Design a binder for this molecule. Structure first.
Ligand SMILES: Nc1ncnc2c1ncn2[C@@H]1O[C@H](COP(=O)(O)OP(=O)(O)O)[C@@H](O)[C@H]1O
Length: 899
């Protein structure tokens, strides 16, 4: 209430003749600034707005709507000398005008201005106006709390200062930095907008220093001895050059403290996690005394839609023929009218973001180990969408112009043939072959026109998959992809169905090179390699095994990738040399993440300077363009700080039940029924790879055409190539026309081999969970892989049998038996029955002839623990109390009503 009265009084210093409406407007503005910015939920904010309006009307029942107008009540002293209220649009234009100069100065990164930005900027400016302005910007990473802070601090002419934090950064260094910032604040009279983040704190002593820096503005145990005398020298000089009389030592120190009071603004940016705030309050009470905390909520659907619309402007998404048959909105308010498919693309992007939010909520509800999606992920997703759309359109345009060049070359060949004619059989053969070529190539042209319909949707789905997914397992990746596909089809945005992510995002040669460089054939590994190839945020590999580390080591052997770690004392030494040379650096053990990497991960290198210099620590080091840093770990799952979570692309190699199911299905299809596996590999190659080989034959034909210069005496040299091209075109046509028969029998074969895969996954994860029973029962994935390879390629029972239906049964029985034999051999002779009947339950789930009997198993396991004492008296002489109670509990079971 004191701040309320102070703010109202300040707003009325130079302003006269204000009506009652203006006064209640200022009252409401101050109430919203001091009572609503601190709320965390939107419900609290709207309740505050409703209650302020109802109290205003109750205590002032004879006022005009001049009290409220537009709910964006904003006051700015930028447009006029006084603290006059301003309109949304005028302030937006002025902020854009100032942002032009801001971009000219530094940070050329574009910032789309939404309603939230203008409000946050005005709040931070209001806090900056008062001499004791201190901020606690609590908001999710990527919201731009730091960016807005710097923008407004520059806009008010405040020299921003930041602490460069690393693992070796000691408390004495913090005291020296505080001495420097206070010297700049008091001496030379510099308005410092000194800022910090939660990552900028590694020792509480920082927090007790800020306690006295905020509450009193003077740090007593900072300036001692020589430092104190030097400080008094500089500040006594500053008093003279600022026209201030020199006094005794104590009075001069007091004047310096007052100068720091009026020339220092400390800003805190914090994780919205309230648990951290609970003891942040305890460590420093001044965080709730001198700091006006400003809660930054997650970017709203309005903000996400505006970001998507503004950034996706360079791309050409204008499709004149588009139909909207259903009503699937997200923004709900701006341009809901039938779109030009660009609004549809942006709506799909924001729906993808909401889809991740819903998936995260569901994962947290039905389990844990859930990571939080920051708006920086949206910016990464938008950049991925733009780059991938550019690539996938430029490549098709260049191959289309190649086809046009080939057509013109064939026309020129026709002209040469007409000149030559005026052997006849050779002429007729080449004439019919070239007519067939004309038909095939006009078909190619119409196909090229067809892919323009699907490029937008396919690239959107691929970018949403690569930029967002990567931490989730195979099942959740598939669920997200199918949800995105269903929504995009429902939005009538044309995307090609049955899209192979691996084949669409990579070519044959890169995939085979990956396979050579120690990469498993699992589709999860291929997708992870895809994410590792193209990326904006430097990867953070999650892998319990060492397969990914050795794979990426092999991938960059030529580039001289150096292996270091955070635990290594020479980590900075090993990283500076790699940065200067331009060599990739793989840093393992990200558990003790070094905060010195924040500038590198944020890619905040200042390109404004002549050479591209990064401010890594105190020193400035030039950023080599080939500096590709990598992060990795050795644990399956661990919680990461959210600030680190928003600067890296989580690529996860951790196995799961669905991953084991897919691997076992692929392995059994490779071993049993290799024809279906070959036909599916041909299907995967049908997306681009076969077309790429056809283009290679096309360019070989083009080379031969001017190699022979239209020879007619020896025409077979080109007739062979033409015949091969015709045969390959016919083969591709047969493969495409069989895409209805195929994936109709392929799906049947796959679902036939599904019980084996699910049984394998269940058996492996039961073996993994066997750690609970006894500390000695520890089994690796390699052990189960050996078991499964043995039961496939080494069974003695499969030597003679060849019928697939009998071979599957024999393989399943052999797998069960061999798994039991290999596991029980290292189990005490009291758990053999336990594992055996666990495998029996797994098989009973696998078989279909009888129900699962889940109620019976639940009873047999725990249902006898139900509490009841009615009818517990034995009725027959041949019965006891415990047996009578067991009779009652079994009579509870539906199968035993009459017992
Ligand atoms: N209004 C905005 N529009 C677009 N991008 C924005 C906006 N505000 C911030 N950003 C982006 O946020 C990134 C910086 O986020 P950062 O300041 O590190 O966030 P935080 O302080 O929440 O951790 C940059 O990519 C910047 O362009």
């Amino acid at each position: 209430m004191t701040r309320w009265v102070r703010g109202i009084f300040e707003a009325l210093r130079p302003l006269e003749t204000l009506p009652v409406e203006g006064l209640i407007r200022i009252w409401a503005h101050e109430a919203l600034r001091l009572f609503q910015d601190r709320l965390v939920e939107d419900e609290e904010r709207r309740w505050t707005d409703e209650n302020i309006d109802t109290v205003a009307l109750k205590h002032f029942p004879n006022i005009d709507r001049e009290k409220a107008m537009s709910r964006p009540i904003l006051y700015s002293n930028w447009l006029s000398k006084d603290y006059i209220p301003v309109d949304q649009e005028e302030l937006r234009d002025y902020v854009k005008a100032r942002l032009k100069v801001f971009y000219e100065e530094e940070l050329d990164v574009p910032l789309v201005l939404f309603n939230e930005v203008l409000d946050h900027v005005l709040r931070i400016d209001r806090i900056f106006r008062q001499p004791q302005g201190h901020l606690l910007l609590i908001g999710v990473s990527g919201a731009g709390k730091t960016t807005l802070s710097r923008f407004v601090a520059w806009m008010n002419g405040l020299s921003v200062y930041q602490i460069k934090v690393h693992r070796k950064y000691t408390g004495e260094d913090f005291d020296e930095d505080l001495r420097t910032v206070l010297r700049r604040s008091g001496c030379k009279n510099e308005k410092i907008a000194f800022i910090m983040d939660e990552s900028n704190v590694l020792d509480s002593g920082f927090l007790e220093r800020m306690n006295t820096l905020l509450a009193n503005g003077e740090v007593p145990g900072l300036f001692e001895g020589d430092e104190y005398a030097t400080l008094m020298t500089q500040c006594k000089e500053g008093a003279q050059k600022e026209g201030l009389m020199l006094d005794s030592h104590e009075e001069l120190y007091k004047w310096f403290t007052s100068q720091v009071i009026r020339n220092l603004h400390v800003v805190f940016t914090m994780n919205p996690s309230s648990e951290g705030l609970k003891d942040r309050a305890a460590t420093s009470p001044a965080l709730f005394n001198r700091c006006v905390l400003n809660w930054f909520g997650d970017w709203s659907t309005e903000a996400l839609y505006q970001v998507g619309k503004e950034f996706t402007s360079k791309m050409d998404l204008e499709k004149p023929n588009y139909i909207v048959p259903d009503y699937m909105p997200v923004v709900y308010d701006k341009l809901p009218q039938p779109p030009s498919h660009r609004e549809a693309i942006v709506n799909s992007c924001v729906f993808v973001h909401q889809t991740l939010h819903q998936a995260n909520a569901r994962l947290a509800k039905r389990g844990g180990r859930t990571m939080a999606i920051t708006p920086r992920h949206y910016l990464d997703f938008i950049n991925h969408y733009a780059n991938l759309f550019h690539e996938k359109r430029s490549e098709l345009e260049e191959q289309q112009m190649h086809l046009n060049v080939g057509l013109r070359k064939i026309k020129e060949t026709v002209d040469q043939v007409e000149e030559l004619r005026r052997k006849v059989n050779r002429s007729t053969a080449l004439l019919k072959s070239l007519s067939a070529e004309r038909e095939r190539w006009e078909k190619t042209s119409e196909t090229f026109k067809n892919q323009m319909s699907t490029i937008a949707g396919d690239c959107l789905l691929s970018a949403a998959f690569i930029a967002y997914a990567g931490y989730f397992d195979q099942q959740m990746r598939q669920n997200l992809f199918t949800t995105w596909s269903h929504h995009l089809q429902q939005a009538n945005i044309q995307f090609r169905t049955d899209i192979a992510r691996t084949e669409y995002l990579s070519n044959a040669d890169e995939r085979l090179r990956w396979q050579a460089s120690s990469l498993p054939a699992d589709d999860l590994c291929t997708e992870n390699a895809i994410m590792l190839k193209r990326f904006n945020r430097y990867p953070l590999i999650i892998d319990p095994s060492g397969q990914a580390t050795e794979f990426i080591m092999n991938e960059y052997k030529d580039r001289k990738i150096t292996r270091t770690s955070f635990l290594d004392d020479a980590f900075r030494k090993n990283l500076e040399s790699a940065l200067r040379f331009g060599n990739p650096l793989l840093v393992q053990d990200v558990e003790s993440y070094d905060p010195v990497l924040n500038p590198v991960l944020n890619r905040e290198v200042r390109r404004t300077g002549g050479r591209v210099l990064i401010t890594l620590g105190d020193q400035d080091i030039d950023l080599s363009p080939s500096f590709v840093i990598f992060l990795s770990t050795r644990d399956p799952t661990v919680e990461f700080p959210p600030d680190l979570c928003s600067r890296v692309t989580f690529v996860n190699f951790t196995v799961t039940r669905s991953s084991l199911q897919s691997q076992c299905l692929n392995e059994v299809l490779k071993a049993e029924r290799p024809d279906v596996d070959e036909k599916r590999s041909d299907l995967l190659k049908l997306q681009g790879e076969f077309q790429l080989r056809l283009r290679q034959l096309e360019k070989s034909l083009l080379q031969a055409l001017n190699e022979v210069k239209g020879r007619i005496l020896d025409d077979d040299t080109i007739i062979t190539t033409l015949e091969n091209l015709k045969r390959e075109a016919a083969e591709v046509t047969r493969k495409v026309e069989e895409t209805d028969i195929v994936m109709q029998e392929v799906e049947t074969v796959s679902q036939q081999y599904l019980p084996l895969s699910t049984a394998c996954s269940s058996i492996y994860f039961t073996m993994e969970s066997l750690k609970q029973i006894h500390f000695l029962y520890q089994y690796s994935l390699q052990f189960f892989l050996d078991i499964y390879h043995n039961v496939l390629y080494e069974n003695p029972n499969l030597k003679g049998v060849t019928d697939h239906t009998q071979r599957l049964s024999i393989i399943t029985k052999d797998l069960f038996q061999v798994a039991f034999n290999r596991v029980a051999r290292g189990m005490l002779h009291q758990d053999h029955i336990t594992f055996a009947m666990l495998l029996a339950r797994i098989k009973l789930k696998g078989t279909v002839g009888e129900p699962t009997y889940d109620a019976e198993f639940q009873h047999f396991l725990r249902g006898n623990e139900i509490v009841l004492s009615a009818g517990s008296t034995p009725r027959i002489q041949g019965l006891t109390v415990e047996q009578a109670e067991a009779v009652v509990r079994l009579s509870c079971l539906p199968a035993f009503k009459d017992l």
